[model samples]
Target: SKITYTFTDEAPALATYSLLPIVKAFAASAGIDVETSDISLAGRILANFADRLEADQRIEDDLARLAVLATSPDANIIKLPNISASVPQLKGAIAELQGLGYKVPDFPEDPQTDEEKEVRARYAKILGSAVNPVLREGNSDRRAPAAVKAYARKHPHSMGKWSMASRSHADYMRGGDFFSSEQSITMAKAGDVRIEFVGKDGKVEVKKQLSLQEGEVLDSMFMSCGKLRDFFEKTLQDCKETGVMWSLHVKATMMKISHPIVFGHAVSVYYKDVFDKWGQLFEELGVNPNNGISSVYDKIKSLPASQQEEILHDIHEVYSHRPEMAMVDSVKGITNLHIPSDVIVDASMPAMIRNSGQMWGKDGKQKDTKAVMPESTYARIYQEMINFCKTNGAFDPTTMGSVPNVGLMAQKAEEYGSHDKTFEMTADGTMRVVLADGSVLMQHKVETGDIWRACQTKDAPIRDWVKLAVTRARQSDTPAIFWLDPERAHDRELRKKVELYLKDHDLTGLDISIMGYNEAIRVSMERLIRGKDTISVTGNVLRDYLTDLFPIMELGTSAKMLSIVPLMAGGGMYETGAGGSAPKHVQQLVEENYLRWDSLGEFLALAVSLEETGIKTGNAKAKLLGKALDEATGKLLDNNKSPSRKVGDIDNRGSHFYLAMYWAQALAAQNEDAELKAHFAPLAKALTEQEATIVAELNAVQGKPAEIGGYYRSNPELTSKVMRPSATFNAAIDSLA
Candidate 1:
């Protein structure tokens, strides 16, 4: 009776309002207590200002509390996909909260005072994969469930055709990017380290004070503006001449500080002439390029009509000189540079790769693309996949093997964990990481307008990562490779540790080895082509990349993957899915009263959570419930009861009804739990009898406008009313009580 579920943002939250009642009602029959925590984007922001708010207005920082709980054995969290918000998203949420009278401070764009600077720093903590670092106290174990994978095989999703002659290819900087500039070191003893900037004029200022654990991998790197601009210029020309779409791929959402700045540079370079002439004016108008071209377009509206016309003309002229640009929403003319979130690397790159290495052009047609990912370290992985697709062929879902991931993500292991340490240089300086004793640990020469970042990975997590990899490899009896590049400084140290740790395991017959990124990917691709499974044991970034890359290819959508983090401190975090929380889906639901967001991830996570809870708490009935729920999920998939895209069809609420029906049926049909069977029998019978009536009631409300109070912060009363409109289905679930 001890499971904690999180209420998060967007379409998932709306879906939760409809489905959670069913879950709680079913669990209550087994005497289980289901608790909910609000970790929505709006809620996270509100919690940060708890001290300032009145007692009645106070909300607990549930994410922080869960981070601590994730280390305990009693923790059983069904974590849904929350917003790893960007600046624009964060600002919007704050605005929404303020309008709701939460008294949350506005996000400071350019902090001018000490108080403002502190406010900005606090807000930064909530941006770009915020909840993950705090809650991921365990390494990731993500794979497609057998049922989901089998369903995909039986009814394969659409795959965009690939041609060997296609001009599509990955583009990256050959030099002066973060990869080439990186410097890494393994700390011999635990101590405090300070990151300080020694400027060209010889003034020293401490940027950050870091605490290091012994054997931690610490590193620093900065991208070159000159080199980045050159890379963009050449890539633009290449795309133009090759007659393909030019698409920029960067993880501005996760990288937060760095990628947005990098994206801004791409925007400037693409419209070099317009920027060269109007750069000062744009700055004077408070148009930050980091927010993207949309900022400029929005800012220009306040200018005199003649000046606004001139700026628009200049932008159009720049477009004429470039290649056909990739479109985010071709119907709305939203280009990639319109927003930072539009071209997230992990999601966008896989989408392009799956679409036969093509991106949507302005004319609303898929064409070969130059997917420009400036960083060479991880970008090579995509290039390897593209070459494989071209040389061999697009993978067959009917026979493709799974790529299970054993990720290194405990205790903020990599880049996503280094947001506070990442900085955009304001002055030309020598950035140095110094020990408390005044000895320099690392140093890099930086310039104004460069992104300098430092990251650390501790020994405990590294050992845990290696152990998890071995365990998974041994259990699955599959080949496992440590995707660590020895030539790179960070990976070199990690590679040594991985080798030492491998000796700690009994690997007499298990296949495991360490290989550089490209070689490892090549082997994985080779094995995949032959329908053989392989486990990729990788650092934080590659874990995120490969999990999305492989899953999107294998399962049509990554949402169905079972992302389990077996916590080191004895608890567990069952993550629902990847991708943003589906803001567009919410918009569709509000307009058409139809939510097409698939809750297959939640169904998968709940089963695992229940199973884990039963094992930990000695609740046999919980285990029985878990088993039945999984069977119900498989049947739901087999029956094709998932949400549909169109109105007058089975939407999210309808899918929930089917899942509930099947779950009750499984429980009632089971013999292991006699009491459970008797209790659910009548409920199952009633649901089966009224199935058609319930489905009609769910469909009857579609094709009409509906509202749920707010976008980021919805009114729960109204949301429940909108999401649970099927009275026949609602009564059936309530009867389980």
Candidate 2:
């Protein structure tokens, strides 16, 4: 099997341009094939509108085809993080495509016609967490590599001290949230199902038609807007009285349809006086509060002078009465409500929790916060963690154990699988799902402006998920717990399937059990404090949540973990790391030509990919390469050769040179395969001979502006030229080839 690495966007893409060539050269020595497919945000956008492009301009739908390939036994994919484009990012990509002569239509913000709605639907497929669900046709096995864990232990990162008496904690809805209102069912027969809305006057409108298979678990739910608004006000007042910073956390990026509208409510409620006084005028001016307060600022630019001043004055008046909000960027004055995409819950909450439940205040100091999470389903986990931290104090990196996750994501398992079925209610009605035989499967009462969503998980993925959890438990000899609360309808269905599947395996002294979410968290935290490992078997949303939550607490960054997706059908997909800081790194690179992206995750992932390829293809030489690469990576960390934050120091490009030098030296020093050693010995000597020259060549380009032609769609020739400016290092690698 060949190793297929993906081409992505921003600084990572530039890193790929330099790194992939070296990978190809090294893999070629072992007669292994390494290839690439373009799956950048711009690439995905262009592929979606392939029919609109000219013959020569069209690119294949690599991501869609890759999803199909993921089910094959020979599949080996090295996936990189790509942009989960927000609305602004989407519009920018569309404009770039249109400027390049592709006839792609602009994104429809507020669709008024059928044609506009169709266009909007097409665009929606490309937004927020768009690429992951499609490619994740497997369960995840994420952990910190031994080498990385050891390094972090020896050189621990900073941790904020948690006070026992601190009142900082996570608050969420007690009732009327998505968790308590959900209804689910398992389809007995394969057929078509339709989503329909019935009005009070008895008029029925079919919203969507979905094809279903037997044994598919279907679910539908909604959060009451009245309760949501009230929840926000209560949380705000509590924060004000307690003198804690107010912060709202939601997955606006991935749950694009629902959470942004949830964010709009927070914004409207916080600035109630302004929205109440000029709500109609703002609506007529094409102002969407859902896009955040920035959209209001943009819309007011065209208003008359007196009206604009009056609106601004009203907004300031409301701000004066409200509590101080959390700042994402204090210098730039970007608050939590500045943009819908600013504060993503999965990444943000973990960072805040790791920082002693503190967020940046307007004075540029970290202060205690009252984190308001509207959804109670998974928010309870963070609160449990906070309480644990309050009592136990901050965890020690040198002593605490790791939490590896075996996530159920195959075939869209949970909320991550809910995008297509999620919607904002356009009118007051009864939303129902009906089978082809006109029988109602599930229904919910909804009001106008309420956010509603549905999801389905196939039975095959559930069986696969259980099997994976069992396999991981046996392999690690660690206790594994299935995090399913029997109280929730969805988890109840999963619990039955898990129970049935557990009987398929032999229980020969292995520790495995199923527990509710809160209980599981309690047990896991207790084990963690005593330096014991635990495997968390969870659904999609918790998978996304916990991987970040635990990793940030353990290693100071979630990007340091190794995420492997073992495809249910027999393939493997290796995800490198998170993309939370990718945009900032790209900005630094463009301004100063220094890339501070640490490729430890990529290095670890590549070793696993190579070893899997060796096992799959029966190539001894490939296996040797994997071993040598691991040794090289350990040394790279030991020598402190990763990217530095300062310009003129060793950056990503220079780090790559060092890694190559060490890898060649490791291969040369090894006695496993003489042929391989003989071929690499001279190259190793050559790299060491001119190490100073090579590093100088790499460092010479620092502190200067670089033009890669575009941010989303970089010009390849220019990108390659700018990324690989080290002539001496290029010659050394080319000589080895």
| Model 1 collision count | 0
Clash totals, every prediction: 0, 0
lDDT of 2 by residue, 1-737 (tens): 48888998876788888798889889899998887888898999889988788889889999887877787888899898777877867878888877767788988888999999998988888888877888888888888877888888888888889999877899999988899888888888888999988977778888889987798888889998889999999998887788888998987788878888888898889988888888788889887777888888888999889989988888788767899889978998778898887788888888887788798998999988898998999999989999998999998889988788988888877787787788788778899999968999889988887888889899888888888888988887899999998778988877878889999998787999889999998999899888999999999888888988888888877777899998877889998964353677888888999998887778888999999988988898999899899999989989888886888698988888889999999999999899999999988989999999888888899888999887778778998888889887887788877
- Quantify all predictions' global Cα lDDT against the true fold: 0.86, 0.86
RMSD of each: 1.8, 2.2
Of candidate 1, the 10-residue stretch with the lowest lDDT total is 577-586
The prediction achieving the highest TM-score against the true structure is 1
What are the per-residue Cα lDDT tens digits for candidate 1 across 400-424?
9888889999998978677678888
TM-score of 1: 0.96
